[PDB]
Design a protein around this nucleic acid. Structure first.
Ligand SMILES: Nc1ncnc2c1ncn2[C@H]1C[C@H](O)[C@@H](COP(=O)(O)OP(=O)(O)OP(=O)(O)O)O1
Ligand SMILES: [Ca+2]
Ligand SMILES: [Ca+2]
Ligand SMILES: [Ca+2]
Length: 341
DNA sequence: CATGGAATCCTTCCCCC
DNA sequence: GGGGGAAGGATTC
């Protein structure tokens, strides 16, 4: 079992560099403008020239400007990045029938057949990086190992523009040496819960009664960490299928006024439908981001598919249910359609 | 100050043999 | 007691 993970470098920003090479070498910040006030919004991502100074995904645009007032600030163009991503996925396809597209810039390839060992896997890695750089002029990081998780960890250690194999020998030393937090699927909240139980490295998950772990982080997450710690984790590479499509936008001013909100809501529904394209959902959920950044949602599943008129109609009742049961003002409003026929 | 899409898993019901 | 689902939320990438 040999898995090869591919991760495109500072992707959105690198695509902007490819489309305007004069940007290369300069700090580039791709941002999502929320239109509330001058430069309100967050950074979707930045190239390494910008990251070396603290500008990265998640910080407020305003804060990035105080640090790199002279960098190049660009509005995110998801659509353009999606199309460049697709072309890249199709390149990888020619290297394996078994491929899992995990996100817009992450993909796992099950090359258990194509290759016979890590050397031939590595060489296939270089061949892929080179093919993608030549065809699309986009640099990527390849991670190679026994399963998906270590393949990903491999890439994280080797970025940017790297390639790395984590052989069975290192897998074991990592199970003992690797900080539990650097394990995929372990965010801040779960890392903390684990600290309290005294688990700082994967192996530590064995010196704890399972049921106590289950109680603390849940069974699914418990079984997950244990199988990795025992070097027995092995989920197959499968193509994932879209299960929900939705869109959430930001209002210029927080509100509680139904008529002031509807517009942004219908706007989200429209965009969501244009994207559903031929797909018919039986479920709808209205999502609201409260003024204190909390997330509330009300939804309903129908016994048949939802027409756009039914969506408009039903979404307003759900938004009203939200306002009725929560007294806080709304900052962001949106919808999500799921359970496709 | 703090955008945004989406999967999966966890609880709490609820209907019902 | 437990299958079968739907809701609302927690958590992660
Ligand atoms: N907070 C965010 N808001 C919007 N888009 C985001 C956000 N965080 C990440 N993205 C995008 C950023 C990337 O272009 C793409 C994710 O890849 P990651 O974010 O994993 O890598 P990156 O390509 O920006 O970093 P790296 O230098 O490791 O390649 O998802
Ligand atoms: Ca990346
Ligand atoms: Ca990635
Ligand atoms: Ca982490």
């Amino acid at each position: 079992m040999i898995v090869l993970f591919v991760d495109f470098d500072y992707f959105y920003a690198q695509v902007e560099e490819v489309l305007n090479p004069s940007l290369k070498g300069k700090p580039v910040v791709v941002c999502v403008f929320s239109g509330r006030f001058e430069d309100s919004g967050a950074v979707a991502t930045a190239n390494y020239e910008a990251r070396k100074f603290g500008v990265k995904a998640g910080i407020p645009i305003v804060e990035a400007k105080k640090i790199l007032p002279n960098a190049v600030y660009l509005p995110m163009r998801k659509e353009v990045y999606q199309q460049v991503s697709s072309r890249i996925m199709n390149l990888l396809r020619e290297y394996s029938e078994k491929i899992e597209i995990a996100s817009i810039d992450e993909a796992y390839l099950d090359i258990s057949d194509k290759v016979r060992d890590y050397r031939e896997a590595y060489n296939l890695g270089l061949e892929i990086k080179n093919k993608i750089l030549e065809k699309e002029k986009i640099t990527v990081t390849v991670g190679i190992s026994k399963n998906k998780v270590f393949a990903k960890i491999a890439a994280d250690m080797a970025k940017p523009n790297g390639i790395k194999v984590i052989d069975d020998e290192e897998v074991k030393r990592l199970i003992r040496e690797l900080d539990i937090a650097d394990v995929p699927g372990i965010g801040n909240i779960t890392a903390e819960k684990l600290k309290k139980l005294g688990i700082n490295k994967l192996v530590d998950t064995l010196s704890i009664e399972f049921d106590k772990l289950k109680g603390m982080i849940g069974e699914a997450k418990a079984k997950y960490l244990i199988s990795l710690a025992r070097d027995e984790y092995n989920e197959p590479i499968r193509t994932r299928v879209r299960k929900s499509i939705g869109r959430i936008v930001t209002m210029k001013r927080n509100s509680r006024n139904l008529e002031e909100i509807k517009p942004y809501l219908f706007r989200a529904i429209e965009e969501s439908y244009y994207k559903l394209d031929k797909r018919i959902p039986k479920a709808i959920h209205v999502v609201a981001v409260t003024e204190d950044l909390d997330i509330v949602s009300r939804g309903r599943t129908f016994p048949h598919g939802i027409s756009k008129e039914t969506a408009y109609s039903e979404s307003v009742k759900l938004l009203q249910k939200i306002l009725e049961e929560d007294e806080r003002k709304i900052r962001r409003i949106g919808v999500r359609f799921s359970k496709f026929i």
